[PDB]
Write a protein that binds this ligand. Structure first.
Ligand SMILES: CC(=O)N[C@H]1[C@@H](Oc2ccccc2[N+](=O)O)O[C@H](CO)[C@H](O)[C@@H]1O[C@@H]1O[C@H](CO)[C@H](O)[C@H](O)[C@H]1O
Length: 272
């Protein structure tokens, strides 16, 4: 049992939560766990429908010649008794929220997409432990930050290989960076099967596939004991914009987070 006030894993608090949460899921890819079931693989290929993708097992073998192939799938949660995490979305409800110090007080701070901290630190914090990206939504990261690649197609895994070595992939469905500066040892890979678990069990099949925001939340339910959300949802005026500047069912995903908050499995900080 964790030593926090409450523990996300705890069963028999909410049967709605217990129906959905599966403690056996592994959120990160490793050489050990990389075999996909045929149904999961076919579903994952259908997300972006690449023509004639390379063999996935060959692609993953080549990937783990480059980035670490034996990460602990819960990032060494077994060595801590209360891991507290902040998941920071991109909403302009963070503007003038002054949430930075409270965000930075957490053990892990998880960010996503091209969201910057520089010049926004009083609102969004300066700490990042983990940052979710995909080739089409990447920005250079500070050297301490773990990069969590979320792969939506075979080419996303080939892009990690390329962008840290030969720099041969510069376009997917849009232009993508040919090179990144992230150290290979700092790269983590979101497991495809965990994407499908989010879609089937948490989203009950709503949307074409899950948004990055909700993938980040459910990932954090597994790796953390206590989760606080910042920068999710609209602002107080009903605007959806980013704090610095038809694929997903954002209303259904929103409602999952609202329900999670109502049963004290997360806390949501609404901002401004
Ligand atoms: C808006 C939308 O449907 N985006 C899809 C679409 O994207 C494009 C296809 C062809 C040309 C330009 C774009 N694009 O810049 O919008 O199809 C691709 C697959 O080919 C993706 O599914 C786009 O969806 C985005 O996918 C990323 C992950 O790659 C992430 O889930 C975004 O939230 C999602 O909008």
């Amino acid at each position: 049992p964790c030593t926090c006030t409450r523990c996300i894993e705890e069963q028999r608090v909410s049967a709605w939560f217990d129906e959905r949460f599966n403690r056996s899921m592994q959120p990160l890819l490793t050489a050990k766990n990389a075999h996909l079931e045929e149904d999961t693989y076919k579903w994952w290929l259908r997300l972006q429908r690449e023509k004639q993708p390379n063999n996935l097992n060959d692609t993953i073998r080549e990937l783990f010649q480059v980035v670490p192939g034996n990460v602990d799938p819960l990032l060494e949660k077994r060595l801590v008794s209360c891991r507290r995490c902040a998941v920071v979305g991109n909403s302009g409800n963070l503007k003038e929220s002054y949430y930075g110090p409270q965000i930075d007080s957490h053990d892990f701070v998880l960010r996503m997409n091209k969201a910057p901290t520089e010049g926004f630190e009083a609102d969004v914090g300066s700490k990042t432990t983990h940052h979710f990206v995909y080739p089409e939504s990447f920005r250079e990261l500070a050297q301490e930050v773990s990069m969590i690649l979320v792969p939506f197609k075979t080419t996303d895994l080939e892009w990690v290989i390329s962008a840290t070595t030969t720099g041969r992939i510069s376009h997917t469905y849009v232009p993508v960076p040919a090179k990144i500066k992230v150290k290979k040892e700092k790269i983590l890979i979101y497991h495809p099967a965990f994407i499908k678990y989010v879609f089937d069990r948490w989203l009950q099949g709503h949307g074409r596939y899950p948004s990055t925001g909700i993938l980040s939340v459910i990932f954090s339910l597994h790796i953390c004991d206590e989760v606080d959300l910042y920068g999710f949802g609209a602002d107080s005026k009903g605007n959806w914009h980013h704090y610095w500047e038809g694929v997903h069912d954002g209303d259904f995903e929103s409602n999952v987070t609202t329900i999670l908050a109502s049963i004290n499995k997360i806390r949501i900080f609404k901002g401004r």
